[PDB]
């Protein structure tokens, strides 16, 4: 499958292989029965991987086409989500957005994502200027911050991505929260950009 | 006769028989080739003593071996049950006639 | 039986076949014995790849060698023509299964 | 021969063999066609050998008995005299004594030699208190100083030792010079001590 092919290209490149193994070994290391990993360290290693390995390797792993579950599960596992994505606490998306916005880089990366993956009702791709690449890059640029998005399950073609948060407990800001969340979950520009990558 | 040095091979992790059920590929690097440098004085002395039956009956190497002197730090992969593994010192990183 | 390690032998320098005309004696230290530690993953992978005929008709060592990892600094002696000699790295100083 | 036996015992002892090789490799190393060694460095290495290796090894090499020229030449070569002893210029013994006496330690070592090795006319050995050992130690204690003594040739039993100096050019001080020199060259205490050792 394309996701296996992507892992191969990475492992056969010295720099990709090193930076891949580094995030894998940190993110996969259990601390105690109650703590799945050192999350902060895992996120840092993820950031380094996406910052210091070219997109030709990196996007191919993250956005590889799948026809079956085996491939889609591999794709879902790219960021090692049981460490980097999931948590026993599922925060409110607007609270999580607040946490992201205290970090200079997360704030800027989220803003890039909102701008570059903005759904247009006027363009053939639903992306601004039909620029798929800038949307994909902005998606990838959020991994390892406190707005880390991921594939929600191992659906092969029915792709749904989201941060680990919900809009329950929003009080009177429920509409605001769900609109924010839909930039990830229900965005035709992002959908089309990922699908067009192959 | 190619001298002792690094060699490379693309391999499937599952092919190595190490208990990992993974179709991932790694670049496997190893040490092979000839050690044709002039003998050390140690090895020359040792050969002579061996030949004169002066040594205690035992395996005695009086000639260098092409072997790794450093190893790969780590390499990782996802297996067929969706679990990640990291393996240390799988491949050679440097070779010498030791 | 006996594992890879240092051995000692008193020898006449003129016995070593190194061209020194001296009746002086040195303590000659060398590396000998078996390498019985559990195989490295490198070696296990290499053996498997050899057996699967995946390698390239070259001599490949998939098993450690008992060899020196460090050598004697120097030893000296006076020869039969009343000239002094200093020899470097004549003896082993440390051994390992490399 | 006893001198070959002595070298063997030294080389079979880790400390002796290291400190022996060190003075040999330093003293034997030519600097230029006109400078046969670094003398200062050789002398330092000699002092270190006699100070830091026990006399059981050290006196055995310096004072070993000989019946033939091969043995006696070995003995003569113990201090590597072509570097440590001989010199292009052979000073007057009183001038050399003067040089020695400006050095605190040479002055003291020479005085020890005088006290322990100067001959008595009253003892069976010609040494004070018949104390061979203290004389031998004081003799060895002058090696690696300005007053370094050695065997003058490879005579096996006709042992003659001397510093590198002569009593030519003494002027009016010729008797004084020769009396000083005779404590080395014509001293029955020193003769007997060295002979009794082997």
Swiss-Prot record, chains A, D:
Name of the featured protein: GDNF family receptor alpha-2
Record's subunit section: Interacts with NRTN ligand and RET: forms a 2:2:2 ternary complex composed of NRTN ligand, GFRA2 and RET receptor. Also forms a 4:4:4 tetrameric complex composed of 4 copies of NRTN ligand, GFRA2 and RET receptor, which prevents endocytosis of RET. Interacts with SORL1.
Keywords, comma-separated and alphabetical: Cell membrane, Disulfide bond, Glycoprotein, GPI-anchor, Lipoprotein, Membrane, Receptor, Signal
A GO CC term attached to the entry: receptor complex
Gene: GFRA2
Function: Receptor for neurturin (NRTN), a growth factor that supports the survival of sympathetic neurons. NRTN-binding leads to autophosphorylation and activation of the RET receptor. Also able to mediate GDNF signaling through the RET tyrosine kinase receptor.
Family classification: Belongs to the GDNFR family.
Whole sequence portion shown: 159 to 356 of 464
This protein's record includes keyword Oxidoreductase: no
Molecular-function annotations in GO: glial cell-derived neurotrophic factor receptor activity; heparan sulfate binding
Domain of life: Eukaryota
Subcellular location: Cell membrane
A Gene Ontology BP annotation from the UniProt entry: glial cell-derived neurotrophic factor receptor signaling pathway
Disulfide bridge map: 3-64, 10-16, 27-42, 37-83, 66-71, 93-165, 100-106, 117-135, 127-189
UniProtKB/Swiss-Prot annotation, chains B, C:
Keywords in alphabetical order: Disease variant, Disulfide bond, Growth factor, Hirschsprung disease, Secreted, Signal
Disulfide bonds: 4-66, 31-95, 35-97
Domain of life: Eukaryota
Predominant cellular place of this UniProt entry's protein: secreted
Gene Ontology MF, one: growth factor activity
Binding site for heparan sulfate group: 50, 59, 61, 63
GO biological process: cell surface receptor protein tyrosine kinase signaling pathway; cell surface receptor signaling pathway via STAT; glial cell-derived neurotrophic factor receptor signaling pathway; MAPK cascade; nerve development; nervous system development; neural crest cell migration; neuron projection development
GO cellular component: extracellular region; extracellular space
Protein's cellular compartments: Secreted
UniProt entry tagged with the keyword Cytoplasm: no
Coiled coil spans: none
Function: Growth factor that supports the survival of sympathetic neurons in culture. May regulate the development and maintenance of the CNS. Involved in the development of the neural crest. Might control the size of non-neuronal cell population such as haemopoietic cells. Acts by binding to its coreceptor, GFRA2, leading to autophosphorylation and activation of the RET receptor. Heparan sulfate-binding is required for signaling.
Disease: Genetic variations in NRTN may contribute to Hirschsprung disease, in association with mutations of RET gene, and possibly mutations in other loci. Hirschsprung disease is a disorder of neural crest development is characterized by the absence of intramural ganglion cells in the hindgut, often resulting in intestinal obstruction.
Membership in a protein family: Belongs to the TGF-beta family. GDNF subfamily.
Oligomer status and interactors: Homodimer; disulfide-linked. Interacts with GFRA2 coreceptor and RET: forms a 2:2:2 ternary complex composed of NRTN ligand, GFRA2 and RET receptor. Also forms a 4:4:4 tetrameric complex composed of 4 copies of NRTN ligand, GFRA2 and RET receptor, which prevents endocytosis of RET.
Protein name as annotated: Neurturin
Residues of the whole record sequence present: 100 to 197 of 197
């Amino acid at each position: 499958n394309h996701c296996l092919d992507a892992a191969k290209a990475c492992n056969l490149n010295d720099n990709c292989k090193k930076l891949r193994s580094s995030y894998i070994s940190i993110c996969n290391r259990e601390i105690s029965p109650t703590e799945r990993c050192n999350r902060r360290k895992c996120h840092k290693a993820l950031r380094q991987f996406f910052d210091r390995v070219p997109s030709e390797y990196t996007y191919r792993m993250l956005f590889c086409s799948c026809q079956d579950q085996a491939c889609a599960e591999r794709r879902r596992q790219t960021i090692l989500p049981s460490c980097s994505y999931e948590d026993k606490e599922k925060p409110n998306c607007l609270d999580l957005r607040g946490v992201c916005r205290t970090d200079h880089l997360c704030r800027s990366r989220l803003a890039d994502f909102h701008a570059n993956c903005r759904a247009s009702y006027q363009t053939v791709t639903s992306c601004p200027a039909d620029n798929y690449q800038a949307c994909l890059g902005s998606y990838a640029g959020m991994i390892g911050f406190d707005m880390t998005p991921n594939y929600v399950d191992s659906s092969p073609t029915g792709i749904v991505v989201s941060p680990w948060c919900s809009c329950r407990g929003s009080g009177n800001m429920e509409e605001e929260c769900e609109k924010f969340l839909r930039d990830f979950t229900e965005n035709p520009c992002l959908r089309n950009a990922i699908q067009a990558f192959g | 006769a190619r001298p002792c040095g690094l060699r490379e091979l693309e391999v499937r992790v599952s092919e190595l028989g190490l208990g990992y059920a993974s179709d991932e590929t790694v670049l496997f690097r190893y040490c092979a080739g000839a050690c044709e440098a002039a003998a050390r004085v140690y090895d020359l002395g040792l050969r002579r003593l061996r030949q004169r039956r002066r040594l205690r009956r035992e395996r005695v190497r009086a000639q260098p071996c092409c072997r790794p002197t450093a190893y790969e730090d780590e390499v990782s992969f996802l297996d067929a049950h969706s679990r990640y593994h990291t393996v240390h010192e799988l491949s050679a990183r440097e070779c010498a006639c030791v």
